[PDB]
Amino acid sequence: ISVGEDFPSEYEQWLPVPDPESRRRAGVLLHPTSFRGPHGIGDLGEEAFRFIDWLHSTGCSVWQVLPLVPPDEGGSPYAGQDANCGNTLLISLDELVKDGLLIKDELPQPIDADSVNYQTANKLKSPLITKAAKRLIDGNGELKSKLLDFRNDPSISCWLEDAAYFAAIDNTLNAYSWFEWPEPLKNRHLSALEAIYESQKEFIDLFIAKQFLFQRQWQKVREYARRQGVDIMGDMPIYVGYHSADVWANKKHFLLNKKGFPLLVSGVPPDLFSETGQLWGSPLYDWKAMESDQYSWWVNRIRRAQDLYDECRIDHFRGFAGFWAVPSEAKVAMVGRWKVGPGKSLFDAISKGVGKIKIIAEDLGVITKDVVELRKSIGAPGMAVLQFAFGGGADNPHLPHNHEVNQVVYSGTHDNDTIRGWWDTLDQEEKSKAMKYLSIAGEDDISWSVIQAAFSSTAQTAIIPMQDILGLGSSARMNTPATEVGNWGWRIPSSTSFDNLETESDRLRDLLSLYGRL
Amino acid sequence: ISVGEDFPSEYEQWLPVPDPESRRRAGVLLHPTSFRGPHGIGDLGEEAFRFIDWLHSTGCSVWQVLPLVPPDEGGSPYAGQDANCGNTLLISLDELVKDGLLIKDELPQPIDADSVNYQTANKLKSPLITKAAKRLIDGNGELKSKLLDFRNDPSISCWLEDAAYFAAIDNTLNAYSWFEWPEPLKNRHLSALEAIYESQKEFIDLFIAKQFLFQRQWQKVREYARRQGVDIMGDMPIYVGYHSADVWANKKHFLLNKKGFPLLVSGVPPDLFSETGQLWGSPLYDWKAMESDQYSWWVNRIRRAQDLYDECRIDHFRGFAGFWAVPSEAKVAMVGRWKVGPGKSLFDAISKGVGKIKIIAEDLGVITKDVVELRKSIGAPGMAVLQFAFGGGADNPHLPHNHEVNQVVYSGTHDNDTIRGWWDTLDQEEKSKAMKYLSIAGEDDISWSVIQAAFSSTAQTAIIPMQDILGLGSSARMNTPATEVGNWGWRIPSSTSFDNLETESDRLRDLLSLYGRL
Ligand SMILES: C[C@H]1O[C@H](O[C@H]2[C@H](O)[C@@H](O)[C@@H](O[C@H]3[C@H](O)[C@@H](O)[C@H](O)O[C@@H]3CO)O[C@@H]2CO)[C@H](O)[C@@H](O)[C@@H]1N[C@H]1C=C(CO)[C@@H](O[C@H]2O[C@H](CO)[C@@H](O[C@H]3O[C@H](C)[C@@H](N[C@H]4C=C(CO)[C@@H](O)[C@H](O)[C@H]4O)[C@H](O)[C@H]3O)[C@H](O)[C@H]2O)[C@H](O)[C@H]1O
Ligand SMILES: C[C@H]1O[C@H](O[C@H]2[C@H](O)[C@@H](O)[C@@H](O[C@H]3[C@H](O)[C@@H](O)[C@H](O)O[C@@H]3CO)O[C@@H]2CO)[C@H](O)[C@@H](O)[C@@H]1N[C@H]1C=C(CO)[C@@H](O[C@H]2O[C@H](CO)[C@@H](O[C@H]3O[C@H](C)[C@@H](N[C@H]4C=C(CO)[C@@H](O)[C@H](O)[C@H]4O)[C@H](O)[C@H]3O)[C@H](O)[C@H]2O)[C@H](O)[C@H]1O
């Protein structure tokens, strides 16, 4: 219509429509090992479905988990034994009964494990998981046909075969790591791998069958989440452990010497958690090498993650701009150097290979100019953690008035204390600063005040740890960085069920309503 | 530095620097007619400088005024008698004593005017302002030389001459408006204008001298503001009155019939303020005609505003996308229709002619898709008013969780009640809704709770009316839309001075500090 002319009679109702991709929402951070149950550890069975139902009733639409990789021996998902495999100790045994692979009589006696012991859980559950996998590979029915489909899926076998062979070799040998393996296994000579197949054929087929079982139980949890309107946000650990099929089967893509030993290892300089810095110990990526077959190993990680999650947190995102390299012999991280990461070049390859992708940049720590620019050049939202909001002055980016829309706000991460515990240890200048910003009734319910401040944010997504919805103290902390004992063990108390959290559900629902996050 | 290589030793300190154009700030809305003083009305003398000093001590860096045009007879700046002229009743007489144009003995006896009466002020001040202008045009000194410079400034005369001639003709004739003027004055015949100059030469030179005096006092106020770090935000009324030099000297650029009578007039459909809508009564722009000499009249408005202000509010911004046209004979606005505005085409011409300009879009009312898009396509911030936040649900754009960064947040505008008065009339559903969002101590200090909510916003600029800093009731309301009597009259109580507002100053300074607006 030309300037000056009349509009049609429905001009007043030509109102702007809210973008569905801009929808405000809330979520809960809860790793599946924290579910209750009689087998020493949480699993992908009934408790997972009950939690989704409870989460649905709160109005939350996001469930954030830690990485689902097989953890290290202290329970850590961030130096896993493989990059793409699933933690087979998350397999529900009760579910294997529904699938026909176990009979009820075989299910073991319950144990009291108010925290996870990964070794206790392993001794109790692995015999039955192997028995179930044995019955699966023996059968000729529909489930066997689904296993064969899984195996020869081109994008499963490009990681699954190497991982089975690796697990098989490690079962044959007494060595501490693959560094000590004999040269022909260590460097993957065809005949040596052929011999391993012949002598460890059954073990290999069992390992592949256990990965199929994990895959199946997880995809069912995720379908049930989708059915109840819940997206699952996974977690992509930046580094993988030395003793893994990933490092072993792609030596030239890591920073190792001629004999396979790491030249440099991962960590961060002196920070909040340690005076000497955090020495993680992982091997590091030879980025110029990776660049040369298009980061195909990184592109397969993201493809695997797309199959497991709706959305994905990229751990230590800053590491792709610049990474901290410590000499491999060092006993502390504080002696080390910053090195140039792959930058945008990695993310263009992920785009080109995988397509459109929902990524959350965990951009916490030392944030330099090149990190901020990388995050913005791929469009990924960053993070705000309220527990870091009350040091410094009013320009602190974690304070609500400084949040952005394309961002996720946490009360805290799995690396922080709970709110209660954090408030208990808090320095007095930081505490009275926080009282001026927050709305506090009783200090008992400081959790709800912080949760309230997170939801009132302009940030599109607000994530709360289950510990803070339950108002738990420091004994419920999931992880303390720069410590080796007593992490990754927290479980929901055996006496709290998802049917006894109606008050919490309502109180949350009220807040999401109030801040337009339903 | 290539991928994999070491960074230099100052990598940790390559931290991102905050953009100075992103600086958060606060301000006060206060029209100069509201200043105290003995002459029935506020002026650009000592009270203006005292306010700037007080404003500086609070930490605010913005002073927002209403349009400074000569108002209509009820005091309204939004249907002024001219578009570019200054309200000569804002001239300080005490300042004219300092300039040598008046002697102290001539200054009149004080009057008690706790609200402005524009006619009382006109009777009292105009004889002395004319006396002062007479002494100015009679002189041969430095001030006369500055007047001559003002006159022949090419971008002053392209509006000032028409406005003097118009005022001169109106002084000669008994007519109500220029519609009733004889054809040769009405249509600006050369010989008829020549005759006016010869018979009204002195009046004309006096009018031009009064505009010089306004210009001088205003530029001194603005230089003092700049010295104290205070920007002045003006206001660009969208429409100008029928009886003005603007309409008269540019007939073909308005929607008038062959004889000069308006075909259509301005207003808005049925809304919050009136069941029949607001019939403003102004003539309307013939936009296709204006497009044809590049909107040169609009481009001169903005040029004039650049000379008076740092930044400018565009009143009824939505009107440039679509405008409501009511038949001229109508007694209510509710019978009318929406017509297509000039859109981006106007703003490209302003860019091309004036350069870079700091514009605030007053995008309140009925907001259609084409308004949101126009605002965004020129990059202008919009507005949020907290007084409209508590109708509807959690998607209401005036609620703090929905603010954007490129935005100005107000407790209220000059069109709203004060906070106190607003809270006093508030419906009970709206009131308990507000109590859940706001932090309220005593209801007396509801003003400070709303001021707090405005400052805590992510919006880059927060503006508060002086009435709310003083915690005043509805009697201090500046304007009620769709009313004709009792507006534009509010003045600071004669017993409140800027030296007795230390507590207010501190309390504000505390809030700006807390929300990073210092
Ligand atoms: C944890 C987090 O750290 C970095 O960000 C921190 C930052 O450092 C802090 O300063 C702070 O920053 C705030 C700041 O305080 C505020 O002032 C400011 O305003 O805001 C900033 C935030 O912007 O907090 C942030 C965030 O917490 C990183 O940047 C961040 O990405 C990190 N979080 C990630 C990353 C990892 C990486 O793995 C996870 O790390 C966890 O897992 C590892 C691995 O298990 C664990 O390490 C333990 O286990 C190792 C295996 C062990 N290594 C030994 C191994 C051997 C075998 O070879 C031995 O031979 C030898 O003895 C050792 O090498 C480690 O010793 C052991 O510690 C980490 O502890 C654990 O945290 C994080 O979970 C993940 O979220
Ligand atoms: C005022 C404001 O109105 C519009 O926006 C409103 C909106 O209409 C409201 O509904 C509400 O919207 C909210 C809503 O409630 C919420 O639910 C929702 O969530 O948010 C929205 C906000 O987005 O509030 C908004 C904002 O207040 C416009 O869109 C907005 O731009 C307007 N504000 C501007 C514009 C003007 C333009 O004039 C100013 O108007 C003021 O000045 C005029 C001029 O004096 C005054 O009019 C009086 O004086 C006239 C001379 C008189 N005319 C008579 C003349 C005659 C002869 O010619 C007579 O014969 C005849 O009887 C008359 O025509 C008028 O009668 C008289 O009223 C206005 O009253 C005065 O307000 C605003 O100050 C400025 O801020």
Side-chain angles (χ1 to χ4, degrees), chain B residues 315-327 330 332-338 340-343 345-351 353-355 357:
Chain B
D315 195 58
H316 199 58
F317 178 83
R318 72 128 310 117
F320 297 98
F323 60 92
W324 184 252
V326 181
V332 298
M334 108 177 281
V335 166
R337 76 285 197 178
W338 291 102
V340 181
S345 191
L346 175 58
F347 297 101
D348 304 359
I350 295 158
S351 305
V354 184
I357 39 98

Coordinates of all heavy atoms in Angstrom, one line a residue, chain B residues 315-357, unseen atoms left out:
Chain B
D315 N 8.3 11.6 19.5 CA 6.9 11.5 20.0 C 6.0 10.7 19.0 O 6.1 10.9 17.8 CB 6.3 12.8 20.3 CG 5.1 12.7 21.2 OD1 5.2 12.2 22.3 OD2 4.0 13.2 20.8
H316 N 5.3 9.8 19.6 CA 4.4 9.0 18.7 C 5.1 8.4 17.5 O 4.6 8.7 16.4 CB 3.2 9.8 18.3 CG 2.0 9.0 17.9 ND1 1.4 8.1 18.7 CD2 1.3 9.0 16.7 CE1 0.3 7.6 18.0 NE2 0.3 8.1 16.8
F317 N 6.2 7.8 17.8 CA 7.0 7.2 16.7 C 6.1 6.3 15.8 O 6.3 6.3 14.6 CB 8.1 6.3 17.4 CG 9.0 5.6 16.4 CD1 10.0 6.3 15.7 CD2 8.8 4.3 16.1 CE1 10.8 5.6 14.8 CE2 9.5 3.6 15.1 CZ 10.6 4.2 14.5
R318 N 5.2 5.5 16.4 CA 4.3 4.6 15.6 C 3.7 5.3 14.4 O 3.5 4.7 13.3 CB 3.3 3.9 16.5 CG 2.1 4.7 17.1 CD 0.8 4.1 16.8 NE 0.7 3.8 15.4 CZ 0.6 2.6 14.8 NH1 0.4 1.5 15.5 NH2 0.6 2.5 13.5
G319 N 3.3 6.6 14.6 CA 2.8 7.5 13.6 C 3.5 7.5 12.2 O 2.9 7.9 11.2
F320 N 4.8 7.2 12.3 CA 5.6 7.2 11.0 C 5.4 5.9 10.3 O 5.7 5.8 9.1 CB 7.1 7.4 11.3 CG 7.4 8.8 11.9 CD1 7.5 9.0 13.3 CD2 7.5 9.9 11.1 CE1 7.8 10.2 13.8 CE2 7.7 11.2 11.6 CZ 7.9 11.3 13.0
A321 N 4.9 4.8 11.0 CA 4.6 3.6 10.3 C 3.1 3.7 9.8 O 2.9 3.6 8.6 CB 4.7 2.4 11.2
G322 N 2.2 4.0 10.7 CA 0.8 4.2 10.4 C 0.2 5.3 11.3 O 0.6 5.3 12.5
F323 N -0.7 6.1 10.8 CA -1.3 7.2 11.5 C -2.8 7.2 11.4 O -3.3 6.8 10.4 CB -0.7 8.6 11.2 CG -0.8 9.0 9.7 CD1 -1.9 9.7 9.3 CD2 0.1 8.6 8.8 CE1 -2.1 10.1 8.0 CE2 0.0 9.0 7.4 CZ -1.1 9.7 7.0
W324 N -3.4 7.6 12.5 CA -4.9 7.6 12.6 C -5.5 8.9 12.2 O -5.2 10.0 12.7 CB -5.2 7.3 14.1 CG -6.7 7.2 14.4 CD1 -7.4 8.1 15.1 CD2 -7.5 6.1 14.1 NE1 -8.7 7.7 15.2 CE2 -8.8 6.4 14.6 CE3 -7.4 4.9 13.4 CZ2 -9.9 5.6 14.4 CZ3 -8.5 4.0 13.3 CH2 -9.7 4.4 13.8
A325 N -6.3 8.9 11.1 CA -6.9 10.0 10.5 C -8.4 10.1 10.8 O -9.1 9.2 10.5 CB -6.7 10.0 9.0
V326 N -8.8 11.2 11.5 CA -10.2 11.5 11.8 C -10.7 12.6 11.0 O -10.0 13.6 10.7 CB -10.3 11.9 13.3 CG1 -11.7 12.1 13.7 CG2 -9.6 10.9 14.2
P327 N -12.0 12.5 10.4 CA -12.6 13.6 9.7 C -12.7 14.9 10.5 O -13.0 14.8 11.7 CB -14.0 13.1 9.5 CG -13.8 11.6 9.3 CD -12.7 11.2 10.2
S328 N -12.3 16.0 9.9 CA -12.1 17.3 10.6 C -13.3 17.8 11.4 O -13.1 18.4 12.4 CB -11.7 18.3 9.6
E329 N -14.5 17.5 10.9 CA -15.7 17.9 11.6 C -16.1 17.1 12.8 O -16.9 17.5 13.6 CB -16.9 17.8 10.6
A330 N -15.4 15.9 13.0 CA -15.8 14.9 14.1 C -15.6 15.5 15.5 O -14.7 16.3 15.7 CB -15.0 13.7 13.9
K331 N -16.5 15.1 16.4 CA -16.4 15.5 17.8 C -15.7 14.4 18.7 O -15.4 14.6 19.9 CB -17.8 15.7 18.4 CG -18.4 17.0 17.9 CD -19.6 17.5 18.8
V332 N -15.4 13.2 18.1 CA -14.6 12.2 18.7 C -13.7 11.4 17.7 O -13.9 11.4 16.5 CB -15.5 11.1 19.4 CG1 -16.4 11.7 20.5 CG2 -16.3 10.4 18.3
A333 N -12.6 10.8 18.2 CA -11.6 10.2 17.4 C -12.0 8.8 16.9 O -11.5 8.3 16.0 CB -10.2 10.1 18.1
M334 N -13.0 8.2 17.6 CA -13.3 6.8 17.4 C -13.8 6.5 16.0 O -13.7 5.3 15.6 CB -14.3 6.3 18.5 CG -15.8 6.1 18.1 SD -16.6 5.4 19.5 CE -16.1 3.7 19.6
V335 N -14.4 7.5 15.3 CA -14.7 7.4 13.9 C -13.4 7.9 13.2 O -13.1 9.0 13.2 CB -15.9 8.3 13.5 CG1 -16.0 8.4 12.0 CG2 -17.1 7.7 14.1
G336 N -12.7 7.0 12.5 CA -11.5 7.3 11.8 C -10.8 6.1 11.2 O -11.4 5.0 11.2
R337 N -9.6 6.3 10.6 CA -9.0 5.1 10.0 C -7.4 5.3 10.0 O -6.9 6.5 10.1 CB -9.6 4.7 8.7 CG -9.2 5.6 7.6 CD -9.9 7.0 7.5 NE -9.7 7.6 6.2 CZ -10.2 8.8 5.9 NH1 -10.9 9.5 6.7 NH2 -10.1 9.3 4.6
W338 N -6.8 4.2 9.9 CA -5.3 4.1 9.8 C -4.8 4.3 8.4 O -5.3 3.7 7.5 CB -4.8 2.7 10.3 CG -5.0 2.5 11.7 CD1 -6.0 1.8 12.3 CD2 -4.2 3.1 12.8 NE1 -5.9 1.8 13.7 CE2 -4.8 2.6 14.0 CE3 -3.1 3.9 12.8 CZ2 -4.2 2.9 15.3 CZ3 -2.6 4.2 14.1 CH2 -3.1 3.7 15.3
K339 N -3.8 5.1 8.3 CA -3.2 5.4 7.0 C -1.7 5.1 7.1 O -1.1 5.2 8.1 CB -3.4 6.9 6.6 CG -4.9 7.2 6.5 CD -5.2 8.6 5.8
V340 N -1.1 4.8 5.9 CA 0.3 4.4 5.8 C 1.2 5.6 5.9 O 1.1 6.6 5.2 CB 0.5 3.7 4.4 CG1 2.0 3.3 4.3 CG2 -0.4 2.5 4.2
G341 N 2.2 5.5 6.8 CA 3.2 6.5 7.1 C 4.3 6.4 6.2 O 4.3 5.5 5.3
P342 N 5.3 7.3 6.3 CA 6.5 7.3 5.3 C 7.5 6.2 5.5 O 8.3 5.9 4.6 CB 7.1 8.7 5.6 CG 6.7 9.0 7.0 CD 5.4 8.4 7.2
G343 N 7.6 5.6 6.7 CA 8.5 4.5 7.0 C 10.0 4.9 6.9 O 10.3 6.1 7.2
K344 N 10.8 4.0 6.5 CA 12.3 4.2 6.5 C 12.7 5.4 5.6 O 13.7 6.0 5.9 CB 13.0 2.9 6.0
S345 N 11.9 5.6 4.6 CA 12.2 6.7 3.6 C 12.5 8.1 4.3 O 13.3 8.8 3.8 CB 11.1 6.8 2.6 OG 11.4 7.6 1.5
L346 N 11.8 8.4 5.3 CA 12.0 9.6 6.1 C 13.3 9.6 6.8 O 14.1 10.5 6.7 CB 10.9 9.8 7.1 CG 11.0 10.9 8.1 CD1 11.1 12.3 7.4 CD2 9.8 10.9 9.1
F347 N 13.7 8.4 7.5 CA 14.9 8.3 8.2 C 16.2 8.3 7.4 O 17.2 8.8 7.8 CB 14.8 7.2 9.2 CG 13.7 7.5 10.3 CD1 12.5 6.8 10.1 CD2 13.9 8.4 11.3 CE1 11.5 7.1 11.1 CE2 12.9 8.7 12.2 CZ 11.7 8.0 12.1
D348 N 16.1 7.8 6.2 CA 17.3 7.8 5.2 C 17.5 9.3 4.8 O 18.7 9.7 4.6 CB 17.0 7.0 4.0 CG 16.7 5.5 4.3 OD1 16.6 5.1 5.4 OD2 16.4 4.8 3.3
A349 N 16.5 10.1 4.6 CA 16.6 11.5 4.3 C 17.2 12.3 5.4 O 18.0 13.2 5.2 CB 15.3 12.1 3.8
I350 N 16.8 12.0 6.7 CA 17.4 12.6 7.8 C 18.9 12.2 8.0 O 19.7 13.1 8.2 CB 16.6 12.2 9.1 CG1 15.2 12.8 9.1 CG2 17.3 12.7 10.4 CD1 14.2 12.1 10.0
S351 N 19.2 10.9 7.7 CA 20.6 10.5 7.7 C 21.4 11.3 6.6 O 22.4 12.0 7.0 CB 20.7 9.0 7.4 OG 20.0 8.3 8.3
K352 N 20.9 11.3 5.4 CA 21.5 11.9 4.3 C 21.8 13.4 4.5 O 22.8 14.0 4.0 CB 20.8 11.7 3.0 CG 21.4 12.2 1.7
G353 N 20.9 14.1 5.2 CA 20.9 15.6 5.4 C 21.6 16.1 6.6 O 22.2 17.1 6.6
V354 N 21.4 15.4 7.7 CA 21.9 15.8 9.1 C 23.0 15.0 9.6 O 23.8 15.5 10.4 CB 20.7 15.6 10.1 CG1 21.0 16.1 11.5 CG2 19.5 16.3 9.6
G355 N 23.2 13.7 9.2 CA 24.2 12.8 9.6 C 23.7 11.9 10.7 O 22.6 11.5 10.8
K356 N 24.7 11.5 11.6 CA 24.4 10.6 12.7 C 23.6 11.3 13.8 O 24.0 12.4 14.2 CB 25.6 9.8 13.2 CG 26.0 8.7 12.3
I357 N 22.5 10.7 14.2 CA 21.6 11.3 15.2 C 21.2 10.3 16.3 O 21.0 9.1 16.0 CB 20.4 12.1 14.6 CG1 19.8 11.5 13.3 CG2 20.9 13.5 14.3 CD1 18.5 10.7 13.6

